[PDB]
Ligand binder design. Structure first.
Ligand SMILES: Nc1nc(=O)c2nc(CNc3ccc(C(=O)N[C@@H](CCC(=O)O)C(=O)O)cc3)cnc2[nH]1
Ligand SMILES: *[C@@H]1O[C@H](CO)[C@@H](O[C@@H]2O[C@H](CO)[C@@H](O)[C@H](O)[C@H]2NC(C)=O)[C@H](O)[C@H]1NC(C)=O
Ligand SMILES: [Cl-]
Ligand SMILES: [K+]
Length: 203
């Protein structure tokens, strides 16, 4: 149970999960229990936020249908109090902990990949390798802009590879209670609580 209802020790996270009534737009489904502040939830909706100075439009403008998924992902990363069982210590300059091999529901990965098909990028790992010397990430030497499909030939390649394995792709369905959903209605409770509960008891 020590892995339940926690916030990892990372760059913006709160020390502990709490109610956040004013979570902005896409993060609001987390408003009953979040690891992010309202300010953070607000900032992550912005192009090239002050959170990480990360530019989504690094190979031209990213399609809205695609960008929403990255915003959604950032909501989960910053707000989720239910990733306890996958938290690992990594000792990095901008975070002492992170999560790895979170069982992301296949349909979520599939939808993300499909909606991002018509967008563009220059790298398959977005955590390491950028040219930051202007202050925001720019394609490094040798990295050409291409379609998403080029750098991520399958859904799993994007979902698992883009954020250096924060996720593994689960063969479980949305609503199985056996995989983490990036996209959920939380009117009747956050569905990923049950997921974290289940995998914490697996030991
Ligand atoms: N699911 C998910 N998992 C994550 O870990 C995650 N992380 C971020 C934060 N993203 C980033 C990406 C790059 C850099 C960055 O400054 N990269 C540098 C190296 C940083 C270092 O010293 O470790 C670079 O090499 O370009 C920081 C934060 C956003 N969404 C996520 N979403
Ligand atoms: C992931 O789940 C799917 C079903 O949602 C599994 O599919 C079935 O697999 C068996 C063989 O193992 C087939 O007889 C069925 O035809 C499959 N169902 C359909 C309609 O596709 C799939 O095997 C699972 N993947 C893994 C690796 O366990
Ligand atoms: Cl839609
Ligand atoms: K969650």
């Amino acid at each position: 149970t020590d892995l339940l209802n926690v916030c990892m020790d990372a760059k913006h996270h709160k020390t502990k999960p709490g109610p956040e009534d004013k979570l902005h737009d896409q993060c609001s489904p987390w408003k009953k229990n979040a690891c992010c502040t309202a300010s953070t939830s607000q900032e992550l909706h912005k192009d090239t936020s002050r959170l990480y100075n990360f530019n989504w439009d690094h190979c031209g403008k990213m399609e809205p249908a695609c960008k929403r998924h990255f915003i959604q992902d950032t909501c989960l990363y910053e707000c989720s109090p239910n990733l306890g069982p996958w938290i690992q210590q990594v000792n990095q300059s901008w975070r002492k902990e992170r999560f790895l091999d979170v069982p992301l529901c296949k349909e979520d990965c599939q939808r993300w990949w499909e909606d991002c098909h018509t967008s563009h990028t220059c790298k398959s790992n977005w955590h390491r390798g950028w040219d930051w010397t202007s202050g925001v990430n720019k394609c490094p030497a040798g990295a050409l802009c291409r379609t998403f499909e080029s750098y991520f030939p399958t859904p799993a390649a994007l979902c698992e590879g883009l954020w250096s394995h924060s996720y593994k792709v689960s063969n479980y369905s949305r609503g199985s209670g056996r995989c983490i959903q990036m996209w959920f209605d939380s009117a009747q409770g956050n569905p990923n609580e049950e997921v974290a509960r289940f995998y914490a008891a697996a030991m």
